[PDB]
Every structure is written in structure tokens, then in C-alpha cells.
Amino acid sequence: MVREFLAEFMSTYVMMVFGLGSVAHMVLNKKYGSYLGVNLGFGFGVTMGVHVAGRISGAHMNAAVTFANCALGRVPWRKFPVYVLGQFLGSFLAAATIYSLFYTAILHFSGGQLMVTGPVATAGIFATYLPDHMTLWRGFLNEAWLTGMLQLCLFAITDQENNPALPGTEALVIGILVVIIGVSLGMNTGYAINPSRDLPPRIFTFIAGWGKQVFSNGENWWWVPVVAPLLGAYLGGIIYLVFIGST
Amino acid sequence: MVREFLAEFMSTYVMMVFGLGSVAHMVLNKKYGSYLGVNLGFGFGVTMGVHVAGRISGAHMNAAVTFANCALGRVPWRKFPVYVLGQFLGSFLAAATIYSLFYTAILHFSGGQLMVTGPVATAGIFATYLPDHMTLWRGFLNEAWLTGMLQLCLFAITDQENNPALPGTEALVIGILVVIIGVSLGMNTGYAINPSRDLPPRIFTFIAGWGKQVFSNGENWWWVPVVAPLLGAYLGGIIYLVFIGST
Amino acid sequence: MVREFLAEFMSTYVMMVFGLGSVAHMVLNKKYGSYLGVNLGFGFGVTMGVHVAGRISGAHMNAAVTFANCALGRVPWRKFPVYVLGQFLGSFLAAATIYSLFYTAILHFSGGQLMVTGPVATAGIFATYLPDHMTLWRGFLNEAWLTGMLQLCLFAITDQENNPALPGTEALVIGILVVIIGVSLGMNTGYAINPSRDLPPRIFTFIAGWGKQVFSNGENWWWVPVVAPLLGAYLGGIIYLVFIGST
Amino acid sequence: MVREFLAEFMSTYVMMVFGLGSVAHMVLNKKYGSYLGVNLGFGFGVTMGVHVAGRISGAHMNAAVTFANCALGRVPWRKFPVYVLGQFLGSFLAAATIYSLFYTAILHFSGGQLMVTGPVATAGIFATYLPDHMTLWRGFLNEAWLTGMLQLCLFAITDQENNPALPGTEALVIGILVVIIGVSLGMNTGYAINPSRDLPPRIFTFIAGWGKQVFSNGENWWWVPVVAPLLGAYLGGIIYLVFIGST
DSSP, X not given: OHHHXXXXXXXXXXXXXXHHHHHHHHHHOTTTOOHHHHHHHHHHXXXXXXXXXXTTTOOOOSHHHHHHHHHTTSSOTTHHHHHHHHHHHHHHHHHHHHHHHTHHHHHHHHTTOOOSSSSSOOXXXXXXXXXXXOXXXXXXXXXXXXXXXXXXXXXXXXXXXXXXXXXXXXHHHHXXXXXXXXXXXXXXXXXXXXXXXXXXXXXHHIIIIIOTHHHHHHHHGGGHHHHHHHHHHHHHHHHHHHHHHHO | OHHHHHHHHHHHHHHHHHHHHHHHHHHHOTTTOOHHHHHHHHHHHHHHHHHHHTTTTOOOOSHHHHHHHHHTTSSOTTHHHHHHXXXXXXXXXHHHHHHHHTHHHHHHHHTTOOOSSSSSOOGGGTSOOOXXXXXXXXXXXXXXXXXXXXXXXXXXXXXXXXXXXXXTOHHHHHHHHHHHHHHHHOTTTOOOOOXXXXXXXXXXXXXXXXXXXXXXXXXXXXXXXXXHHHHHHHHHHHHHHHHHHHO | OHHXXXXXXXXXXXXXXXXXXXXXXXXXXXXXXXXHHHHHHHHHHHHHHHHHHTTTTOOOOSHHHHHHHHHTTSSOTTHHHXXXXXXXXXXXXXXXXXXXXXXXXXXXXXXXXXXXXXXXXXXXXXSXXXXXXXXXXXXXXXXXXXXXXXXXXXXXXXXXXXXXXXXXXXXXXXXXXXXXXXXXXXTTTOOOOOHHHHHHHHHHHIIIIIXXXXXXXXXXXXXXXXXXXXHHHHHHXXXXXXXXXXX | OHHHHXXXXXXXXXXXXXXXXXXXXXXXXXXXXXXXXXXXHXXXXXXXXXXXXXXXXXXXXXXXXXXXXXHTTSSOXXXXXXXXXXXXXXXXXXXHHHHHHTHHHHHHHHTTOOOSSSSSOOGGGTSXXXXXXXXXXXXXXXXXXXXXXXXXXXXXXXXXXXXXXXXXXXXXXXXXXXXXXXXXXOTTTOOOOOHHHHHHHHHHHIIXXXXXXXXXXXXXXXXXXXXXXXXXXXXHHHHHHHHHHHO
């Protein structure tokens, strides 16, 4: 199963470099970054990852997507740890890549202080953090529902028995899906919708010196992007299957 | 006819979550929302709905589109109430979904006051409201003409006997059409162009506590996005058919 | 030849409604309009026009494109007046459509004064005007070169003997071409690149009451978007053919 | 080998006119230019170049892409000088084209002073310059890694034995790749990722009167966009091949 491991590693790495890089732009310089830039970077970063691993492993790049596909009987459970290990390694090294490419920008921006959110936050470049208007319950609800939207539309785009994207263009349409999840639903939680996108870079910032607060901030927010997308992806996939089965 | 009902429900729900979510971004935070974001959210939200229901029901997601297709002899009139019921239910629940996902943002933004438009409007997240420079007559004219543009281009994109989008890519091109209706024509009325997009979320805000003024504002504006698109879609479809019939 | 006349009329009308509408947004409200919006509106407005008329007339929507295709021996010269008449009529009525849809916005913006450019310009919604940093010679050079870029890339996108866009997707790629002509080259002259886009709406503003200065402004700028694109399109097409002929 | 020379010349010229034009917009007028505009201009400028030369020469438009393809045994080394000469000539003349089209804008902006970066920089319209927060080592690291990302994703998009873009749409997907390299990774060095994009326009500005400092600025930055992309493209291609070979 090293084939799927390496494909999930390579695709998740590529996707996360584009994703985290666009967030670094938005955080570090308003002249060269924006929330739309983040929407595009993660969105079409997913497109590139699909071209890398789509026909080798499926290019899940997302532990919740793998969980839903295994729990729904489309991928054997033995592949779940292989996929998630590949995703976690690729996303961790993507975080390390962005940190090194943007090192001087991060240091010039923060005055040398790796801040989680003081005068100048930088931990948010790598992982999601609850805005202060949000509660942890409503953050859980958002991450679950948004990952449900992801899984349902992922199925619709690739369902060969319904109305899929023309073969050879699914990577583009999937990318657009991730773009508008950010455009339409992302301001409330940073639309992590992906345990592999959120936890490995958070672990990196802890190792890189941002401190214990990358976990405890937002009322121990760190575990929600791990658990809520798992439930959301499964529920979104269930809803699509019940929908198609009824049609 | 439950097949088409469920497909219209699911596609309209998906489209409207992406649509209303992007408007919530634009209203509630200028850092994470913009009018272009709204153009993209509704536009490619339509793309996802087409993938859901396109080959089951046609993915009308729009009572005026269904009305024009029935009035032009392409869908039997018996399906009209089934389609519209599905669209209204999906769009109503999409409004309820956005309200719950953005609940704390709406409350933090408005100070707890569900305002239609006072110091901080929020009713406009869900339904269209006439800008003060507009008259109701010119608002009717806009909604009719814009829905006519929608129906004519919808026909052109999907006309297998003319120059359609390559099969398997129509969802993308249709989405782009809805993007630029917003980009080019949307500032005058909020380009409702869709009774199912406008009335069900307006009814939701009335039930949610925004009050009677969601209907009476803009000189009883509420009925125009219901009636004007019906006429516009029919006229736009008639013009395309007369155009092709003459060629 | 009424087939091609009606197709050029309908496609040019559709393209110009999307085009002029996006410029009206940019002029009249900075919250709902931008230069990128104009790039997208004209660009994907062209996409919709290609779906309307692409397989009936070729969807030239542009007198310079028709001139280059006739002068290069691809369309008989007898069709040239038929195409241009259709384009001029469609674009004129598109100008009339935008004026009526945006009438109250234009009146609220200008205080009731149809200004060419005083305190609040509105004539620029419909036709191009030289920025004050520009000379008429360099404006001629821009319109010629930009229309040359258009014609050369149009040929490359549709050349079945080279590397064309996949059939059924050319409308999208052509639209993107028009998007980036605006993004990359449009600030110097408004990238008219199209006599049918520029002169008919200029004539409309003269009839609508903007006055004689729609022609005499910019050192009699009005004739350059008519003549310079004709030369540019022909030269750009010649360069592509010499390029392919040499390969 | 004049076939490939002329194709590389024409495609690089087209790509660089769109690319440099969008940067001129961003530098010279904030109303009509933006960093996203630059991302789109270079990105879909690449799309047009691929349509020009994709099936004649491969539309490398990039000396590092040609170097990696020759060093990886996909193009004979005898074609390397032919490709690079064509790219350098096309990009040089594109710089000359932008300078002449934007001449009055450059003169009005700078007050007549061709400045590299004083009160009003304009040399950055044509070539990349290190931001002051950057070191030359980290600039080398960025240009190498970003060109590696380019080459790896280029291979993935066009790999007929893996999961490529549908034939006839690769130009679009490749363009999107170049868009998001700018969106996600471009603020640190201007993502030159291309010796043919950087050195010929830099040489033009030296000849045009910007002075010796176009080379010596940024601690002799000029050579890094020449050497670092060569190494990065080769390494990115090696990584993809080792990835696929292992799968």
C-alpha cells in the first residue's frame, strides 16, 4: 500500500503548499494577499493535488474524506491509516516549507516574535483559530456542516452514474468547490474541513516555537477540526447516497 | 414525481447555501466578503447544484426557469408544482442553515438586533431589497430583463442543435453565466432572477423575527422577484426560440 | 444572409449587455464594481455570445474581427456589411438597454447631469475615452496592438490544425482571452479593440443627450477605436498565418 | 529547428506581453491593477502561449522548463539553445512592446524619471527585485522551490500515463497553475520561476536607460532568477519521476 501512501503524501504536500502560502500572503501583506487569494490558493491547490494522485489513490488529501469513503464502504479500512499517515506527513512538511520560504517575512512582520495573536499574529498562517465572536459549539457545527457540503458535492462531481464532471476535468471542478466553500462559508472557522490540513501544521507551529497556546486557544479548539469533519464528511456522503438511492 | 422533487430540493439547497453564505460574508465582514465573492458564491453554487440534479430533474433551482420551460412546452405543467415545492423547501432550509451557521456573527454584527436596515442591516443576507435610488417599476424592469438574459443564455449553453457547452462541462459554463449576471447587472436589484431564491428566505427572516418589514420594505418589493422573473424567463426563452427558428 | 445577421445581432447584444453593465457597476458604485469586474463582464460576456452565434455566424461580435477574416480570405466580402450591421444594431440596443436598466443609478450618481467627465462622468459607461496621460498617437498604437493580440490568440484558440481548445470549450478560452486583454493592456485606452463595441454606444450617448463632446473629446478620439482595430486585427491575423505557414 | 525557435518566440512573446502588462497595471495605477491581476495576467498569458506553441514546440516559454526537460532526457540537448534563444528574443521584444504601449503612463507616473525604486519605481514592471525583508539566500531558496513546484505540477497536468488534464484543456490548467504560484508563493521574490521571463526584460531596462542598478540591486539579484529556476525545475521534475516510478 506504499503506492497510495506516496500519492496521498505528494498530493497533500502540493495542495498544502499552495493553501498555506496563500494564507501567508493574506496575513503578512495586504498588498499581495486577500481572503479571495486564500480561497483560490487552497481551491486550485486541490486541483493540482488531484492531478498528482487522483488516479493512483483518489487524491483524498483529507482524513475526513478517507474516513467517509471507508465508513461508506468504498475504501477498505486497512487503507485508512496509510492514507492519513501520508496526508499528515505531506501537510506537516508543507507547513515546514512555508515557514522556511516565508521566514524573513514572518520575522519582519512580527518583529521576531512568533505570536499566536498579539499585536501581530502569525500562528494563523498554518492552522485555524476561532474568531472571538464564535463559540466552540457553533464552531463544531460549522466544521461538520461545511465538511458535509464538501463530501456531498465531491460525490456529485465524480458520480459516474449521475451527472459528473467530464472525465479529465474533475480536478478543476473539485477545486472550484473548495474555492467557494471558502468564499461562502469560511469566515466563521477558517473552513478547516480537513483534519490533515489543520492538525499537522498546528503541530509544526508548536515545534517551531509558537508555544502551547496553538492547542489551548479558542477553548481547546484544536480537536474540533479533527473530529467535526469526520462526522460531517460521513453525514454528507450518507445524504448523497440516500438521495441517489431514492432517485 | 418524487425523483424530480428530491433533485430540485437537493440542488436548490446546495446552491442557496453557497449563495446566501457569500452574501453573509459581504454583509458581515468586509475583510472576508465582497460583491465579487457573492458573484462567485451564487454562480458556482449553481454549478454544484447542476452536478447534483442536472441529469435527474434538469437542476432548474429556479421557479421562473421551470415556468418558462413549461410555458414553452419543454416540461409538462404537472411537474411545475413538484419542482417549485422542492425549490422552495430547499431554499428555505438553506436560509435556516445560514442563519444557524452565522448566528453569532449576525448577533455580534447587529448587537443582537435583527435589523432590516437600520444602523446594521442583516435581512439583506437572505433576500433582496431595493436600493433607495431605485423605483419599483425600474426594479420590475431589471428583474424581468435579467431573468430574460438568464433564460436565453441557459438555452444557448445547453442547445444540442446549436453551439452548446461540451457535455460534462455545462455546469461550469452555467455557473459563469450566473457569475456575470451579478458582475454586470446585479447592483440595481440584487439580481434575484429567481422566485425560489428570494421568497423562501424572505419568509424565513419573517419567521426568524426580522418582522413584517421584510415584505413591505421597498414599496412592497417582495412580490416583484416572484412575478418579474416569471415573465422575463418566458420572454428570454421565446426570444431564443424565435432566434433559432429564424436561423 | 439574414442567418448571420441575426446571429451577429443576438451575440453582440448579449456580449455588450454584460460588458457595458460591468462598466456601469465600476463607474457608479465602488462597492459593487471594479476594473476586474469589467474584465470579467466583457470577457465572459464574449463567452455567452460565442454560445449564441458561434456555429451560425462564427460569433465575431467585432467589426475588426470580421474585417480581418474577410481581408485574410476566410469570409466572403459580401458578408462584411451584413455582419457589421448586425453587430452595430445589437451593440446600440445593448447601450439602450443598460441606459434604461441603470437610469436611476445614472441620475442619482450625476445629480441629473449626463456628464462626459465633469464632477461625475457617465459617458464612459458606454464608450472609451482617452485618459489625460495619453496621446492620440499612442492611443492608436494601443488599439492596433491590442486588437492584433486579440486576433492572433483567437486564431490560435480555434486553429484545428495547430493546438486549439477542445471543441465545445472554445467559448470559455476566448472569454479568458478577452478577460486578460483587459487585465494586462486595458488601462491606456479602455481596450475598445472593437469598432462595434465602441461606436454604436457612443452614438447612443450622443442621441441620449450627452452632447457633441462624446466625439470631440480626446482630440477627436472617436474614430481611433474604429480604424486602429481594423488594422490591428488584420496584422495580428497575418502574423499568425505567417507563423503557422513557416512552421 | 527553426520550427521550435519560432514557436518558442511567438508563445513567449504573447505570454510576456500579458504578464508584463498586468504588472504595469499594478505598478502604475491602483484603480486598474492589483496583485491578483498580475496573477491572472501571467497565468492565463501562459494559457495563450500554450495554444500558440504547445503542439509545435511544447510551449516551454521558460529556459528552466527546457533545461529540466533536456536534463531529464525528454528533449535533445541540441534544442536547448534554440528554445532559449527564441524565448529570450520573444520576451525581450515583449518588454519593448510594454514599454512603448505604457510609455506615457510610465512618464506621467515617474515625472519623467525612469526610477528603479526611488519615490516611484518602474523598473519592477519588467523584472523582479528582492523586497527588503528578503536575503539573497532565501531568495535563491524561493526561486528554486517555486520552479520545482512548477515543473512537478506541469508534469502531473500533462502526464498521459497518470491523471492528466483532458487533451485540449491542458492550456487552461497550466495557466491556473501559474496563477496560484503567484497567489500562494509570489510575494517573496516576484516568483520569476523563469530565466526567460526575468533576464531579457531586465536587459531591456538597462538599455532603455534605467541604469546599471537593474543588475546590482538586491545584492546582485539578477543572476538568481537565471540559476535558481534551472536547479528547481530539474529537482521538481526528478521528484515527480521518482514519485511515478515508485508507483
